[PDB]
Design a protein around this nucleic acid. Structure first.
Ligand SMILES: [Mg+2]
Ligand SMILES: [Mg+2]
Ligand SMILES: [Mg+2]
Ligand SMILES: [Mg+2]
Ligand SMILES: [Mg+2]
Ligand SMILES: [Mg+2]
Ligand SMILES: [Mg+2]
Ligand SMILES: [Mg+2]
Ligand SMILES: [Mg+2]
Ligand SMILES: [Mg+2]
Ligand SMILES: [Mg+2]
Ligand SMILES: [Mg+2]
Ligand SMILES: [Mg+2]
Ligand SMILES: [Mg+2]
Ligand SMILES: [Mg+2]
Ligand SMILES: [Mg+2]
Ligand SMILES: [Mg+2]
Ligand SMILES: [Mg+2]
Ligand SMILES: [Mg+2]
Ligand SMILES: [Mg+2]
Ligand SMILES: [Mg+2]
Ligand SMILES: [Mg+2]
Ligand SMILES: [Mg+2]
Ligand SMILES: [Mg+2]
Ligand SMILES: [Mg+2]
Ligand SMILES: [Mg+2]
Ligand SMILES: [Mg+2]
Ligand SMILES: [Zn+2]
Lengths: 135, 213, 25, 101
RNA sequence: CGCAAGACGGACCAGAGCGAAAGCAUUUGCCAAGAAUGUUUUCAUUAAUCAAGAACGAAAGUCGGAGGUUCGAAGACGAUCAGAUACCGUCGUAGUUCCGACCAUAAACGAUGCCGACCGGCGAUGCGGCGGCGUUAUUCCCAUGACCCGCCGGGCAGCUUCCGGGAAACCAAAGUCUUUGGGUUCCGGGGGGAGUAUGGUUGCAAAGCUGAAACUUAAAGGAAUUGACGGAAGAGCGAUUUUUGUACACACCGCCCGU
């Protein structure tokens, strides 16, 4: 079940890591990014709205997706790290580093890392008003 | 219930003959059930490949988009679709005490491919310079931009797509622009940073086979 | 009282007078 | 009582400056007044560096860096401690803090 | 992987530039305008400030058309709370965008009218001009661009000073003031009542301009000092001699606002 590839060569996929401040996505696709291998979100592991962005849920999701993609026959992954972007923050959430480290732990080979956060040349008005969020 | 990956098949994707390395990975597609043909879903896919994965001795911050054009029995045949730079290269090129000059042109090749080329350059600080900033006046910027546009135009419309990609692989256009603009104002980090495909000619199998050998 | 809101209250009272103190009356 | 000679902003010889939005709270603050910070860091942290360098398929593959421009309003800059209050004499000193060791 | 609409031009972007002020940042073209510098050109007092009278004038707002992506007064909900009619979150109407008519108000601020003269240093910076060893590009040559060292003239600013001012904070102007007179416009007279009533005038409206009195009160207010608090980290006129803010000083168990 998978590609017929010699032991020396590595089958490559692309891992999209969406690290928000509310959730974390680890998504695996082929090199064209049109076919999905496995997608696991941080909300599937923890049954609480607080811990969806926690490093622990990201680590669990990374291990689950690594096992699923190792079943099918993908041994190496390219990494596309993404933040929410747009009008909002460009800084990745707290689960990105933990998810990446867990993905490395599970025996997966690591290709090239690339930041793919969407950056406007200029955008629509941001939510909040003149005085901002006063909490 | 029923595994969707039991009906999947793996195909091998090839790069055009312009590059040294040909096998650029594998891809997956659902088998034909008579409703949807696997070939139709296979076509039209875009792959972003770093230049270091296509040529051994070339830089890795230049990426190429290749689009599958035909399927030949477990062999997807791709063609040039675009070129771009990595995010960190562009982010590290832009600095605070210098001038940035950008230009874009729309040029058609001899074989019908219409391209949009983008070029970027930065002013260079002198070796013995004591002044903190290195700013070019507006007329100097306009002259530099016009020199960029004419050089980018004269290196595409004369050649065809196969020769255009050959010039893009080492980025000789950027070196020509950098050399030509020394007299106006010294420039470093001159690059052709993005290339877009606007219009394609009608698909020809013989052209693709000549492109792949 | 903040001077801005005092001014707004004065304006609203004047508008109320103007509605009551009609020119027709 | 004027607290600063430059009024806490960098506006000289012009009338209006377009506002930007605070990264923290999305408040509108003039660009010259805002507190700016350029952050260049590594995508992977210190432990992740050693964990990734062994699992990579390349030899001496350099990890990419993250470049971010951050804008803060006065309240968010003070609350986040990126900026602190100084003495009346020490306010004038506008040398950046000695981060270079 | 494409398509469509609308709005905005990130990074470069600075105590940098332009504009009478509001204000002004993707490329290219067209149109008219302008400061500064250069000048052994021309006119020869043609000038400065300005009742009356005019042009422009952020945002919001009003009336007609066109579009309506995002955001979003009002509003409907969910939370928080002793209570929230608020702060927080989900939606969301006018509006936010363009054209044509109104409106003329901002902490429209340098809280500092314009023209002219004089009165200390220093290093940068933007524009124009002048001079000069030396590095670079235009394959050679001048010459022109990029650096380097200076000089002059306008411009945005900075540091320093027992120039002198000022209650001080501070100011090379806020100096050249009892040693009081260069020209000229606007404008203030203890704190409230009050920018309120009325009259006039402008506007479709909202409102804009001009603008009192009766009455009430012994202080209100500026700068700085020592304390006390905080759900913050020889020198000065003189009091006086961890940082910081204060409207507290019977010192937060304070003071104080409106029903
Ligand atoms: Mg959450
Ligand atoms: Mg959730
Ligand atoms: Mg707060
Ligand atoms: Mg203003
Ligand atoms: Mg500041
Ligand atoms: Mg000016
Ligand atoms: Mg831009
Ligand atoms: Mg008048
Ligand atoms: Mg308006
Ligand atoms: Mg409006
Ligand atoms: Mg309308
Ligand atoms: Mg709300
Ligand atoms: Mg909303
Ligand atoms: Mg006024
Ligand atoms: Mg101001
Ligand atoms: Mg005033
Ligand atoms: Mg000068
Ligand atoms: Mg200039
Ligand atoms: Mg010069
Ligand atoms: Mg006098
Ligand atoms: Mg009085
Ligand atoms: Mg009285
Ligand atoms: Mg003594
Ligand atoms: Mg004494
Ligand atoms: Mg305070
Ligand atoms: Mg104060
Ligand atoms: Mg005190
Ligand atoms: Zn903020």
């Amino acid at each position: 079940l998978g590609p017929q590839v010699a032991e020396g060569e590595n089958v490559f996929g692309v891992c999209h890591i969406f690290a928000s401040f509310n959730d974390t996505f680890v998504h695996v696709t082929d090199l064209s990014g049109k076919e999905t291998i496995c997608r696991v979100t941080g909300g599937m592991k923890v049954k609480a709205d607080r811990d969806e962005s926690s490093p622990y849920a990201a680590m669990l999701a990374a291990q689950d997706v690594a096992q699923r993609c190792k079943e099918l026959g993908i041994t190496a992954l390219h990494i596309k790290l993404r933040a929410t972007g747009g009008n909002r923050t460009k800084t990745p959430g707290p689960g990105a580093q933990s998810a990446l480290r867990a993905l490395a732990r599970s025996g997966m080979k690591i290709g090239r890392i690339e930041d793919v956060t969407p950056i406007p040349s200029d955008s629509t008005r941001r939510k909040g008003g003149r005085r901002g969020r006063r909490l | 219930v029923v595994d969707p990956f039991s009906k999947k098949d793996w195909y091998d994707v090839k790069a055009p003959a312009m590059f040294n390395i040909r096998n650029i990975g594998k891809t997956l597609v659902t088998r034909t059930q008579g409703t949807k043909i696997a070939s139709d879903g296979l076509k039209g896919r875009v792959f972003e490949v770093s230049l270091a994965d296509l040529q051994n001795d070339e830089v890795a911050f230049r990426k190429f988009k290749l689009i599958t054009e035909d399927v030949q029995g477990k062999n997807c045949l791709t063609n040039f679709h675009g070129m771009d730079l990595t995010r960190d290269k562009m982010c590290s090129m832009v600095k605070k005490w210098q001038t940035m000059i950008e230009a874009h042109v729309d040029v058609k090749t001899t074989d019908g491919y219409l391209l949009r080329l983008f070029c970027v350059g930065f002013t260079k600080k002198r070796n013995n310079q004591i002044r903190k900033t290195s700013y070019a006046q507006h007329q100097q910027v306009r002259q530099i931009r016009k020199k960029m546009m004419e050089i980018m135009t004269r290196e595409v419309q004369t050649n065809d797509l196969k020769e255009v990609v050959n010039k893009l692989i080492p980025d000789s256009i950027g070196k020509d622009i950098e050399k030509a603009c020394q007299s106006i104002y010294p420039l470093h980090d001159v690059f052709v940073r993005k290339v877009k495909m606007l219009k394609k000619p009608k698909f020809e199998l013989g052209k693709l086979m000549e492109l792949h050998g | 009282m903040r001077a801005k809101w005092r001014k707004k209250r004065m304006r609203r009272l004047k508008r109320k007078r103007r509605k009551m103190r009609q020119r027709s009356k | 009582t004027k607290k600063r000679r430059n009024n806490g902003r960098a506006k000289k010889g012009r009338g209006h400056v377009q506002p930007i939005r605070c990264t923290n709270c999305a408040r509108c603050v003039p660009k010259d007044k805002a507190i700016k910070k350029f952050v260049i860091r590594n995508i992977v942290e210190a432990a992740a560096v050693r964990d990734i360098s062994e699992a990579s398929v390349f030899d001496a593959y350099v990890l990419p860096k993250l470049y971010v421009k951050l804008h803060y309003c006065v309240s968010c800059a003070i609350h986040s401690k990126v900026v602190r209050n100084r003495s009346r004499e020490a306010r004038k000193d506008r040398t950046p803090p000695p981060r270079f060791r």
